[model samples]
Target: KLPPGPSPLPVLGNLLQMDRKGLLRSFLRLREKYGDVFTVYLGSRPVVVLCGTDAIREALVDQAEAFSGRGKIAVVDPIFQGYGVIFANGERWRALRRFSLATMRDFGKRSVEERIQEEARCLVEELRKSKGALLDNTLLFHSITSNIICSIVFGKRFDYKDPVFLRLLDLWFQSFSLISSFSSQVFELFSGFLKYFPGTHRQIYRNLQEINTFIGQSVEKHRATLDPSNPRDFIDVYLLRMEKDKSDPSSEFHHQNLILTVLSLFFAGTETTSTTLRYGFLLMLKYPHVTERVQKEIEQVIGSHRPPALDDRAKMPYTDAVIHEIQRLGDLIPFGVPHTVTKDTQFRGYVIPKNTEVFPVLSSALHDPRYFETPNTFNPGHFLDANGALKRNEGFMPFSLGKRICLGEGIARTELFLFFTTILQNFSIASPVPPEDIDLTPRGVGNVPPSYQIRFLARH
Candidate 1:
């Protein structure tokens, strides 16, 4: 039955029902009407959405190879041009994915914690300097998160006030914002004729090019000082690989792949981690009881003045549950990166042709009532057992699932737990608006929450 779904016009303008978030009101409506595998045709492309926890798991985990294609993103592919690790499929993606992951493992083990600790200190200082003043700390959060990736990939972290680094953050935020917009989809649909349609719409591509140029220039600088044997950072390793396969014309470790891979990692690493923190704090401000519980858990486990580490996650179940809830409720990358079928596959009752575009909607399971008691509400209790031990749920795929699962998950989890506890340890955050009057729900446009002014009351 080609998976029951909303009918469409010749133009196929169902508006995809609306929202880039994983679970929207539209999804609930669709879930009630026609469940499981549903297809949304963006222009002429049949994008299948693997909805619900079991369905998402079955397709992504059970049939890993059938969907292990980091191939196409309707909105992103047009801009990235299937060149980066995220969009490139088959051999090109496989080589870079394998190598990039291995390199991340090496780099992460060496410096990830230290970098996050230092960045968290910078952010804490920035908030402390404000002295409980209401301020939007998005850039601080972005800088802190992005600096971690920069430290590993480029072998350095930028000072908070570095103009070049600040500009790069602006460009990065601009690119991320545009991608989640309604226009980005339109751009993707008609990307072929962008040359003929030069308005503010084309500015997105220009901004992307500027960011790419910035990344490429950084790569060149790193390349100039690289020591192959010592391998200063990720770019150095890629440079070494490029040289190794220079004679082989088909190597994925070329100049373009190196630059794009770094860019892709930078975006993947920065956006999700920072966004989760941003959203978590917003929730903290909204729910003081939840914040206090998490703080109490932190106090019991790590005590005041002790920095939070990844190992403490197990010791503080409530704290861990809070972080897990934040990720689940934050629902970052709701639509998630698109996937393509490796082969013609029989999924459920329908035959999904080879290379069929799939939306491994991770959010589908995140907010599913089947798994979460208060699926729509932000409840830490959802992750907590009756005895207060943090429990794991199969639906908890914040990084998604399977072979193409988010490579940055390991680093991101570390970054999140440390930064959150460190920041909350010294400062109690509250909204300027009355606890009840602090409602920004109407102001929310999508799953990704914007940086709003918050008061970081000095705990001491």
Candidate 2:
């Protein structure tokens, strides 16, 4: 009596039948067999998937309130601790979200755009040091993006070679990879039983502890020398808020929330933006024509004498379209953060019960044929009109949509535009191998750029 799905077993449901390695592919297959907005049983739990644009819009856009609740996913709770913007719900989520947004605005007053430009310049300098030779830009981009967040939150940037900074980055990547692996799913399936076993779960717990310890130490350090008179970074502002709301018992603003918030920003903001840029480079190398067009646009608009600024984005439509297309085709986060129905809701003639986990499949919306002309192809024309101006595609949602859209959209946009334009303006990226053979599929857990290296030659 679930929405029509392939027959399921009593105890395991469809768990045994489904291929664990091909999770995304299995979802795509399911979409083909069932239509958009179909239900699947995940161990007795009826989870609804909103696939494609029309279905997603109907659920996420039109019926947002009914579908807005973050579900009880076992994996997300341990890491996020039901705090921070990504996982928290109800009044707590609302207050923290509002405060975080306002804090970002206040920080932006100090010229975040210029800071991104400076980081981009440093990146270009680092690439230049290689003398236009082939090198993995992963570590370089990671360092640059991490520094951007550091400047915003810590009010200081670390040297790329700093051992402590490198250790922190390593821990961040390891946690992300582990959380996105099949082991995470196994842990989710047998949560109580797995805790008793000494295996990957233990490592995951240890890694989380390390991350928490690092963030906690940083928070304590910042608190000791925090200047309420002239707050400098995110930690200072948060500390001041905690002091102001000391009497308010309901206020979620405290040391734990502050540390987690900072950690979330550091982890979510750094990995995602850096990975997108890494893919941007790979796409540029694969699609020479697109790369040339972007370079041409940058040169015509900003000229080659100086680095491209965020404001320059207005004049570079083609370049912007290319970036949008990269994000669209890239399909960064395939299975978006899961949500649970807060109350029983009727949708498309189906009764979705309360507490049921719902996954809004964003990849389906991004690549749906109804929205994009060639859903599978890497074509920027999807975002361009007959006039060659950038036309906003309602379907293009790399950062997701609705009330739970990415909190750092503004900062992310500035970073992506500045870094992308800066690199294209200064260097011409090319792979030694044929473009067709270059693997564009994500290799690591979560959405990551395919493993590939390229030479970045200085553009005259």
Candidate 3:
């Protein structure tokens, strides 16, 4: 049986409670009342919200297969059931997910790493343009991160000021905002009603359509010049695979899947990592000592003459711990990818019916006092042992966990380490405002990051 929660009224069934403090806070509030496992309703569907590291690990890792179903989508598909890699369920989810993972790692380990190092140099040059005065790096960070994905998917990088590139970044952020907005909930709640009207859902529809059109155009361009002997990027390889699997009727490698999968990779790849960098810099501005500490470590190992590499991360424990602490405190993607139960499952003495949506409060785990000593504060010591070496705990899960972890965790980590190190090696971060007054609280309603402006003086 699901643990206690406020009773539902007629058709509302926990709707009020769910929408009360936004999604992220609502989950935390529920966990307080119902303990580890509790039930909440989205209109009529019952969801079992799992709190803390123990409960989440048990379902997501231990009972991995049983809880591996896809969560809710914009609208239920009568045919394929959420059909792309991130949203798809059953065999389709498994197949596409498996393929996406392989593709991400294949390029993630080599090409992505090389591109980021090159891009980090570009970033430093961009920062140099500011001449150490106060600067809002929001768009610059977003542009650099998106360019990495652009190289991966579009097969080439774009000029940061390229109109098309800027437009794509605009649409990307807009799509992210809309998907996580109240309209997303309204659309899911009354999708049949709103799809016909010019409402928020319609904007979402057009937003998705525009993204699809853009990717479709890119795909067509690739189709025209794709070389079989030399597939340039993800789209090129996917086009080649689509051709190879053309004869097989059972193949999931088709046009629709290709479009959505590319979008999946793009959406997942962009924004979050950049926003994380956004938060990182803001924290650097707020904590000069934190920046100085990492810079000292960076200088001690890599020195000022050359750029820091992935191999250097192990030797720079303080830098590694600082990054870990940033991620832990960043709380990016607090409520994990909405998941579902695969079957009638007995979890912790409660039977969750098949297809029941699951909410894993990753924020709780990341901020769990059980694992992190000062869970509420920014302490790199959380990841450092008594000997000052970088140590990690199972509770640290800013990228979710288990089989459904962020597809680009490897690349994102690489980017974070490379970009952060490169910048610190070149500059000493400062803020116009006093560090004591800098609010470390995040900026948005659900799953937010700190937004601030700062100065970056070149290290002499």
Candidate 4:
């Protein structure tokens, strides 16, 4: 009993009909024909697509429990195998989510802010080394974001040039690219049989294997040095939990879970925030007036003498609006992490059967016409009212909502504000090419920015 949708061909489903280049746009087209809640298929799998803020809100927020189940995706399931937070469902997901959230919140309250501020300082110094020379900062942005996760999970940050750290960053980017490519979508359909063949798909598993070895060794190091009375970092805390749960065979706290969860945290924590920052800077370059106004706010609020702080965020509404708009138009993670119906669910005069895959089109909500006046445009006023105070909108969902809302939302928010403001406070970013020449087109599924260079002119 699925919602009405366009007819699917056998085996292929609607994938061939989809506009692969503009996947989000294709979903919009489907929404126009079949309305918001509609069915489509990936191979034999039926995926219910939830478009618009209202439709997404009803399913993800209103009916949170029914839609809380994690959907199986071929690209991820093989490596994850129901072990970590993102891919694991039911009791295992609950256990891991609870522990991960509590631990993340604890760190959020304590020292993560200092860690981010320190990272921002390092980023500013790194930019200074460029000496206003044109440079591409993808690796630098990745380093700062990954280092923040490293500080939390491993209790330390690495030098940007450290060979091991560089390799880890390489793997993170490689995995993101492979997963975002069309090949991965094909992999999703044919993985059952494709597993036997050799191609780019094999590289994804190999990358994860290398990442696992890195995290696994780190776990062993933490286990040997664990102080039950005091936990130094995420690994230390998880190791202690494993010790506590040793007698309970049902507990999800174990060595394999630790390794995978850390991997999940590292991957989840790094790319999204860094990608947002990357997009934000490119937007800043494209719209210099916006950047000028934000810098004006920075000058008035933080006074260029001190670095931006979390406390400073409250007074900087203009800067806040700019960041919000960047996220809005950037539309990263357009098709949010897949969700599944926890059970046969009733809604909108239709039933989504148990275990049916769901794609809550986050980009649809972010660009929903009802909430945003210029939904498709990159305007900051969507987030600011007439009085110039930052106004919150239901559609501003860069971090997807409900039971599956991102675990790293708080920290990611802190980093985006701090990193953007910190870098802007020190440097006036200028593109080597004119503003009109700057291309904001996404290179792939992740809304990754096209390769570009910018000059970081020190303000003071």
Candidate 5:
């Protein structure tokens, strides 16, 4: 009745075997030692690790519902309050997900795309002010992504110089990395005992409090002027839904849920996309040939006078491939968000019990040699055919897959495309030294960009 796995100690389990750094490398190593579908115990918990294409496809795609539950990551639960799309489960998850999908579509129709393009223009204008000067791309990228989410959720955008907005962004990014680190895991593993300690745990709580207060105030302001008949932004729409379902005892649409959902979108949608763009700019600098080809395609197709649009993706194949390659090789969420089995399910002759956490290990799938020709390389040719048309690779699951796929895929894709292409169209990316030796290794557990500064020179 045991699932396939390496031998483990009775009490400590496989804790000693896990790597603290090079997580993707660790998983790749484990997959090589043990076959595709195997178990690795984290303390006493048996985490099912599914590597390779067939096993991942079967678990995540074929038997999705059976393995639809999320893993018990203690750090996120308190910060998120189990009220948002990322943390909510079962009925609440369904309700919020449905509403969110609809809201994203509505935002799209109500000129969300235009707002993003406008932000792109503003971003280009900001870089223009730099005038080919060396700058940290992280803050600027964050400002653009935050502004886009601000426009969507609050119907307002902040000035880059606004101290309040900048402080919030700083706090958001800090908390993001902290919560994704092993320190967060330590807190999660001993939540009851850790609160008594006076170190990182206390700081984590303080960070959560600050974010909660800020979001609470924003939600309150929106609730006061909300009109069910005419929704203005995300808060308004969520409030209207809450009002409609107020009397229903089973309804998960409430003020708390709304607050968390807004916060989730702000956290999930903004940081990841922004980080990818930061890496994109850095990679463009590293590979001038790729950058030049993208610029050439953009100039020939969209023209520098006009900013690139989402629709232009079809015409600019090289640019599209570069963006896709960035996501593929970038190792965003290398371990992926943890998922669990919802019920006792039989998969490939093994019985996975209910509530057993599952690690999909999407990074392995993305780099699996069976799928991509150059698995370990950053070549864009993986996403392009010989004729230079944009192509789709089945192994490219940067955002993960199935029913619990990234909710903001459309928005993220559009933002990455418009922001990246528009910036490259106006500027040339160059690093003083080759980027390979620049320490691109991500800092924390999440697939984040390493800290690096680069110069952006105007094309003209």
Candidate 6:
């Protein structure tokens, strides 16, 4: 039998039992009654929920192979159809993941850090335009984040004022926003029937289509300038691989995979990091003391003259700890991308059938009381040792863990570190709203910071 859970009703299956707007809250409540491992139903589909760091680590890490498969994301499954690295399975996933990881490593080693450093400076310049006036940095952050990925995937960055680039970002923002909306969650639960219904969810497809068309245009441009001898970007490398594998009848490298994988990188790289930074700045405003400490550490470690480099992270324990805590408290991707069983497997005395969808509940791990002393509070001391050095916490799975960890983890980390330190080094962020009045609650699908304005006062 499956893990014990609250009984499900036929067809409707636990629909009345969940809070769609706050599913994580429901999971927390259910964990108290059902323990760490339990079954929950979204419509008639049985999903196995694994709570706490131990349960998540045990299944995701211990039985990594069995849990390596990508689960269905109903909202976009029809579009993706399991073609790219994020959603594909079996040999297809194996090849794409391996190639993407190696390519990213190569790019990371070559110039990704330098690219982020440049974009971080660009962001600083853009902020200087604010003249310390009240500003919402959402679009600015989105532009820089998307530009970083653009430089890698498209082989060049876009101008902040570029209309096409702005349109693309708008589409992504709209899609990500809708994906977290109540309608999207409803579609996720009842996609079997709702896929035929008219709603805002339909807008998601049109937005993706526009993005795919833009990506397709970029692919064509890459084709016209391809140099087999020296690959310039991700598309070039993949195109070369496709040519070499053209002889293989069963090759996964093809035009369709190429476009979708590029789209995957865009989706994975852009909004998530941007959202984290948005939350980071908001937290800085809410806890000015934390900001001051980080700035003090920056001055002591790297001085205000030079841009903050990744190497300086080694010398700034307080700064590093603060970033870590921000990520912990931000808890982006709280439930994490869904994972599935590759095969029928035994997990914690229960048999999870082959292809069963699993929610590792990363929020559970990040906020586990056993791991963080002040689990509910935004305290950087959670990451600092008694000696004030950065403490390594196993429960910090911001990128999740095991086989399916984020493909862009390396670059994303570099971006967060460089962008945060550089910005704080150049400007002291101040909120129009008081710290006690600030609401740090995450909005909608992502752990997005609430809409707020801040002034980027020049520190120098």
Candidate with top lDDT is 6
Candidate 2, superposed: residue stretches over 4 Å from native: none
Instruction: Mark the 10 consecutive residues where model 3 has the least summed lDDT.
Output: 72-81
> Order of all candidates by lDDT, from best down to worst?
6, 4, 5, 3, 2, 1
Question: What clash count does candidate 6 reach?
Answer: 0
Candidate 5 lDDT tens digits, 281-301 = 778867778888988999899
TM-score of 3: 0.94
* Model 5 global lDDT (CA atoms, 0 to 1): 0.81
- lDDT score, candidate 2, position 398: 79
Give per-residue lDDT, candidate 1, residue 442.
21
Question: Which digits, one per residue and each the tens of the lDDT, describe model 4 over residues 1-460?
Answer: 7898978888878877778547777888888999989999877788999998999999999999999988876776778888899888999999999999888766622499999999999989988998899988889989999999999999889999999999989998899888888788788877777889886678888998899998988888887887778788888888878888989998889887888899899878988888888889999998999999999999999998989999999999999999899888988889998999999999898988899999999999999888899987789999999999999999988889999999899999999999999999999988778889887878745677788888899987
Model 2 earns a TM-score of 0.95
- How many clashes in each structure? 1, 1, 0, 0, 0, 0
TM-score of each: 0.93, 0.95, 0.94, 0.98, 0.95, 0.98
Residue by residue across 21-43, what tens digits does model 3's lDDT show? Answer: 56777778777777888888666
- Report how far off residue 100 is in candidate 3 (Å): 2.0
> Model 6, 1-460: lDDT tens per residue?
6888878888778889977547889899999999999999888989999899999999989999999989988777766889888989999999999999988777623588988999999888988887999988899989989998998888778888899999999999998888878788888888888889897668988888889998999899999988889888899999999989989989999988988898888888989899889999999988999999998999999998989889999999998899899889999889999999999999977999999899889999999898899998998999999999999998899999999989888888899999999999999887769999999987655677789998999876
Between candidates 4 and 6, name the one with more favorable lDDT: 6
Off by over 4 Å in 3: 1-4, 18-22, 75-81, 108-110
